[PDB]
Design an enzyme around this catalytic site. Sequence first.
Site, mmCIF file in Angstrom:
data_model
loop_
_atom_site.group_PDB
_atom_site.id
_atom_site.type_symbol
_atom_site.label_atom_id
_atom_site.label_comp_id
_atom_site.label_asym_id
_atom_site.label_seq_id
_atom_site.Cartn_x
_atom_site.Cartn_y
_atom_site.Cartn_z
ATOM 1 C CE1 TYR A 75 16.686 56.773 29.964
ATOM 2 C CE2 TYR A 75 15.559 54.959 28.884
ATOM 3 C CZ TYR A 75 16.706 55.508 29.415
ATOM 4 O OH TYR A 75 17.879 54.791 29.397
ATOM 5 C CE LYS A 95 19.433 57.512 27.757
ATOM 6 N NZ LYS A 95 20.810 58.063 27.901
HETATM 7 N N1 LIG Z 1 19.397 49.482 32.022
HETATM 8 C C1 LIG Z 1 20.307 50.457 31.985
HETATM 9 O O1 LIG Z 1 21.052 50.675 32.933
HETATM 10 C C2 LIG Z 1 20.363 51.267 30.731
HETATM 11 C C3 LIG Z 1 19.736 50.884 29.545
HETATM 12 C C4 LIG Z 1 19.834 51.692 28.424
HETATM 13 C C5 LIG Z 1 20.559 52.882 28.486
HETATM 14 N N2 LIG Z 1 21.164 53.234 29.661
HETATM 15 C C6 LIG Z 1 21.959 54.531 29.748
HETATM 16 O O2 LIG Z 1 23.289 54.204 30.068
HETATM 17 C C7 LIG Z 1 23.805 55.302 30.862
HETATM 18 C C8 LIG Z 1 24.278 54.737 32.172
HETATM 19 O O3 LIG Z 1 23.151 54.103 32.807
HETATM 20 P P1 LIG Z 1 23.192 53.614 34.322
HETATM 21 O O4 LIG Z 1 22.360 52.365 34.484
HETATM 22 O O5 LIG Z 1 24.658 53.394 34.416
HETATM 23 O O6 LIG Z 1 22.984 54.890 35.235
HETATM 24 P P2 LIG Z 1 23.645 55.372 36.619
HETATM 25 O O7 LIG Z 1 22.591 56.075 37.429
HETATM 26 O O8 LIG Z 1 24.399 54.365 37.427
HETATM 27 O O9 LIG Z 1 24.795 56.412 36.275
HETATM 28 C C9 LIG Z 1 24.503 57.635 35.721
HETATM 29 C C10 LIG Z 1 25.478 58.661 36.229
HETATM 30 O O10 LIG Z 1 25.172 59.914 35.603
HETATM 31 C C11 LIG Z 1 25.382 60.897 36.586
HETATM 32 N N3 LIG Z 1 24.604 62.073 36.205
HETATM 33 C C12 LIG Z 1 23.205 62.274 36.258
HETATM 34 N N4 LIG Z 1 22.839 63.483 35.833
HETATM 35 C C13 LIG Z 1 24.048 64.109 35.487
HETATM 36 C C14 LIG Z 1 24.357 65.394 34.974
HETATM 37 N N5 LIG Z 1 23.360 66.290 34.725
HETATM 38 N N6 LIG Z 1 25.664 65.732 34.731
HETATM 39 C C15 LIG Z 1 26.601 64.775 35.007
HETATM 40 N N7 LIG Z 1 26.450 63.553 35.480
HETATM 41 C C16 LIG Z 1 25.156 63.244 35.715
HETATM 42 C C17 LIG Z 1 24.876 60.285 37.912
HETATM 43 O O11 LIG Z 1 25.447 61.013 38.954
HETATM 44 C C18 LIG Z 1 25.471 58.870 37.778
HETATM 45 O O12 LIG Z 1 26.758 58.765 38.303
HETATM 46 C C19 LIG Z 1 22.651 56.325 31.011
HETATM 47 O O13 LIG Z 1 22.733 57.166 29.913
HETATM 48 C C20 LIG Z 1 21.436 55.407 30.923
HETATM 49 O O14 LIG Z 1 20.288 56.033 30.456
HETATM 50 C C21 LIG Z 1 21.089 52.466 30.780
#
Ligand SMILES: NC(=O)c1ccc[n+]([C@@H]2O[C@H](COP(=O)([O-])OP(=O)(O)OC[C@H]3O[C@@H](n4cnc5c(N)ncnc54)[C@H](O)[C@@H]3O)[C@@H](O)[C@H]2O)c1
Lengths: 237, 244, 235, 240
Positions: free
Chosen positions: C155, C159
């Site tokens: 991961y 990223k």
């Molecule tokens: N702590 C955190 O939440 C955090 C920290 C750093 C980065 N991020 C990044 O921010 C973004 C949102 O994070 P989150 O916490 O909201 O996640 P989340 O799981 O709530 O939402 C992610 C969404 O992506 C969709 N998804 C997954 N695979 C997919 C695909 N192949 N095609 C289309 N849609 C797809 C899922 O259905 C979901 O609705 C992600 O990229 C995550 O890595 C999150």
Amino acid sequence: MLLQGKVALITGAASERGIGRATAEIFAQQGAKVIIVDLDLAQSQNAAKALGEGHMGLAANVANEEQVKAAVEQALQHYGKIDILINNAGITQPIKTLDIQRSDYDRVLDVSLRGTLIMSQAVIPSMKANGGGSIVCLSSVSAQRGGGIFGGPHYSAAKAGVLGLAKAMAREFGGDQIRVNSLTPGLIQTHDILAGIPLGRLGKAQDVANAALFLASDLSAYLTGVTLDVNGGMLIH
Amino acid sequence: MLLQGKVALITGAASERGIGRATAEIFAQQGAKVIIVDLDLAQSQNAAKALGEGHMGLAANVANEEQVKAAVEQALQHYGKIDILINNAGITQPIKTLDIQRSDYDRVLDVSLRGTLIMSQAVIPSMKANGGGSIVCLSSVSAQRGGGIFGGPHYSAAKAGVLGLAKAMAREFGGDQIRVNSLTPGLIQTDMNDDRRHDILAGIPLGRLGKAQDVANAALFLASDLSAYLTGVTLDVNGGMLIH
Amino acid sequence: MLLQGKVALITGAASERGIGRATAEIFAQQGAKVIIVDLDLAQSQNAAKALGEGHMGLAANVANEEQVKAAVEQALQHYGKIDILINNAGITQPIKTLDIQRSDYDRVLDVSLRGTLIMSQAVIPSMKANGGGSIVCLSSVSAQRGGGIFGGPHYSAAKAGVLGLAKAMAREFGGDQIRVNSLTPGLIQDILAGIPLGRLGKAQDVANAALFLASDLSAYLTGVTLDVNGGMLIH
Amino acid sequence: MLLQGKVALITGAASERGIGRATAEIFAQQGAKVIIVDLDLAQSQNAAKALGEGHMGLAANVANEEQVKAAVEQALQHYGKIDILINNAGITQPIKTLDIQRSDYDRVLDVSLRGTLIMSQAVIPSMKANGGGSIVCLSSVSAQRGGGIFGGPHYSAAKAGVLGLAKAMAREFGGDQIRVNSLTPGLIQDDRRHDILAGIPLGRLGKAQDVANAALFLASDLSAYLTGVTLDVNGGMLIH
Ligand SMILES: NC(=O)c1ccc[n+]([C@@H]2O[C@H](COP(=O)([O-])OP(=O)(O)OC[C@H]3O[C@@H](n4cnc5c(N)ncnc54)[C@H](O)[C@@H]3O)[C@@H](O)[C@H]2O)c1
Ligand SMILES: NC(=O)c1ccc[n+]([C@@H]2O[C@H](COP(=O)([O-])OP(=O)(O)OC[C@H]3O[C@@H](n4cnc5c(N)ncnc54)[C@H](O)[C@@H]3O)[C@@H](O)[C@H]2O)c1
Ligand SMILES: NC(=O)c1ccc[n+]([C@@H]2O[C@H](COP(=O)([O-])OP(=O)(O)OC[C@H]3O[C@@H](n4cnc5c(N)ncnc54)[C@H](O)[C@@H]3O)[C@@H](O)[C@H]2O)c1
Ligand SMILES: NC(=O)c1ccc[n+]([C@@H]2O[C@H](COP(=O)([O-])OP(=O)(O)OC[C@H]3O[C@@H](n4cnc5c(N)ncnc54)[C@H](O)[C@@H]3O)[C@@H](O)[C@H]2O)c1
């Protein structure tokens, strides 16, 4: 050896337990002739003799243009060249933001920042004439992460200023083959913080000295404007 | 002899004028026994024998798990340990964003990123059992400045992923004394006839291209005890092309 | 109304508690028409309907070139342009270095890295023809500090790869006025003790940063990595 | 109205076409009451009156502790709070390493670095008592890439020191909800300029409004979870 036939000037290398002395020792072991510049003449001379034969100890406040000029002139008159400059002289103060007074700011900034400028100004002309050189500046992880170790915010600012100065001199004098790089040591020996270090130990003066050796030697001939972290993983970024 | 008594495995070190070969030569000169891992067995064996005596050449695609495990087993059976791992294997491709196809993405990411993971996975268990080690990963200034040199965006992405992987492994295995650091070379002279060279070179303060030996010397530093307190570091070797 | 008259495509914005949905909500509040692209058609359509009027929900796996092309075409057919692309889709796995299998590597890299490439490739042509645009990529503090939060090394690598891709696209398409920037969120809802601001991040915090990068308030920013971590990583 | 009900003090905002004035205008448009602190009282008062109604112009040299204390005392007496501090005051000098004299070093470091410290010291106590605040420090791409634009090495050093100071204050006062972040603008509005412009992916120089909009972001609640950040505003001149 890595520094065969090289002449290195190291500021603040008179203290027996400091990074400067450890760098002077490792540099001397690698074949260099070392010029120790510190505040006390007798201490600097004695430290130079302890290294071995052919070394020199001089007295100068790195923040005093006149004293620096006299020291560099004496070194050039004897050795004829200065290949390496280690701007290691520096002081710290564990005082917080609202307690920093004008004299605290001036003292801390003068040794690290103004001293690095004055010493570099004094040595660069000879380096440019002799076809290049290597300047190593001593910063700190505190300049990168925002203190939180020991030195106050004016120390973090001073060591961050050193990085900006070193990068600016690296760019200006790259065409003259004068490499300018910086070290950002972590917590060096010269509990809670230890828990945040992935390698599970504090740094040694020799660790920073070995990084200075790399940057001073031809092993880093293509490095300039680099900030080399020596913090055991305390700051991964 | 900075690497006296050490055993180093270097991937992609079979090319004549590449960084890997330059690193193997400098490592051998510093007292290390070198294991060259590349695609062609004969080419890898010939490169190892050119270093001197006591070295080894093995064939493996760094993106093929079972081939890597077999090569690592053969190296451990002979030398008994691997002190240093140089993840130098990598390929580049000068294609722009909209022209990157699935196969282009896969090929570039597999050698640099997946290969670094697979090789590191294969060597780390022995390093833990032996009390530590040093892993050096090959990135690129393109991963930091956003390409513009030669490799396309998928190359920039692969080499940036290497940095993320390297730093993650540095944090996970610090307690095992397995240091993990990365090199970010600039424009290095390997296998300069285009007008675009003037612009790039004009942006290098040291005023020259890098040499394979420049990157090899940085790898030597990170592989040796001179960097015993460095982990998770990204060491730029770009002549000032990127000052930041 | 920072996004008045703008059209924004946000991937992975179908989940009710995610950063994507929070970004879609704030974008709609700022005057944008939002296209939600996620895995489930019904969930995406319902999410778009909840935003208000004039929005759209589409189904596509961002790692599937054919499905992405169909979604972007449907969006361009209806709106005629895509001003903003938020590559928010992403997945994580808390598995350590030696436990990462080929399928784990592929799944995690496909959604974040390959998905960002495929979606960007599909939207960039229209942005070039329309005089520019803003692409926001979702990275993570784990890509900078080397994990240690939740996601495993693959991961962190994915990223980090997003940052390299974003920077490369920023440089290539600067002349087209296509700005490409990245967000590096911290812990978004022991770790709390290492956060100077003394709280975890909110989905709305990341959404507000995306709004800044998507709006004209950041017209002179490209290739930027914007940390949203409450001081967890100062560097 | 991103800054509705907020009080913002901006140093060096008396110049007509400077970043500070552009920031004051945008802050006023967003509902803030602005305190302009510059060298000349008349210029500062006129600049504040040009913003609209309810603003204030004060005279102080940021490198003079007692003048800063007096100006901050006067601002706090009238508004009762300072929610935002923009440490925008700064000077530059195009001199090379070997030509930097003691007076040059002092002048450049005093306005940027010492001034940022003195002004922050003067405002932080009231921010702690009011439950938080946002401090924005003005650095430069020169602090990151090693000059090469216009300001000499002492300017690069001063603006790099600002970054170290800002990060240190961010860590110290995070628990007080005092956010501290920095801006690193690129080349903001002939041969040297053309050559620099060629290395800017967006193909243009920055405008004062570009930096002001980034300061608005850091000053507003849109960045409530950002502290210790260095926000580049350089059009891609430096991607790292
Ligand atoms: N702590 C955190 O939440 C955090 C920290 C750093 C980065 N991020 C990044 O921010 C973004 C949102 O994070 P989150 O916490 O909201 O996640 P989340 O799981 O709530 O939402 C992610 C969404 O992506 C969709 N998804 C997954 N695979 C997919 C695909 N192949 N095609 C289309 N849609 C797809 C899922 O259905 C979901 O609705 C992600 O990229 C995550 O890595 C999150
Ligand atoms: N933990 C650490 O030790 C650490 C961490 C980060 C950075 N640094 C920097 O590394 C360098 C060495 O640190 P240290 O722990 O060895 O310090 P130290 O106190 O042991 O030695 C520094 C030397 O500088 C000399 N000195 C002080 N002011 C001087 C002046 N005006 N002119 C000339 N010499 C002067 C002192 O006499 C002393 O000999 C300093 O720049 C320090 O800030 C140290
Ligand atoms: N300008 C540069 O040379 C430059 C700049 C930045 C980064 N790098 C990186 O430094 C490393 C060395 O660069 P180079 O210029 O020396 O490369 P090179 O092409 O000379 O050599 C690379 C070697 O890797 C081997 N290889 C390719 N795919 C392999 C696989 N799947 N398994 C095993 N071996 C494989 C090739 O056979 C070759 O011997 C690469 O990672 C490259 O991306 C190089
Ligand atoms: N290209 C750029 O303009 C650029 C790039 C990077 C950083 N910056 C920084 O942005 C800020 C604004 O830049 P600018 O282009 O607007 O400058 P500017 O000259 O227009 O404005 C600076 C203001 O500061 C005031 N000032 C100077 N010394 C002072 C003191 N001691 N006390 C109080 N006020 C004082 C001046 O009177 C002037 O009104 C400065 O910090 C500058 O270094 C500017």
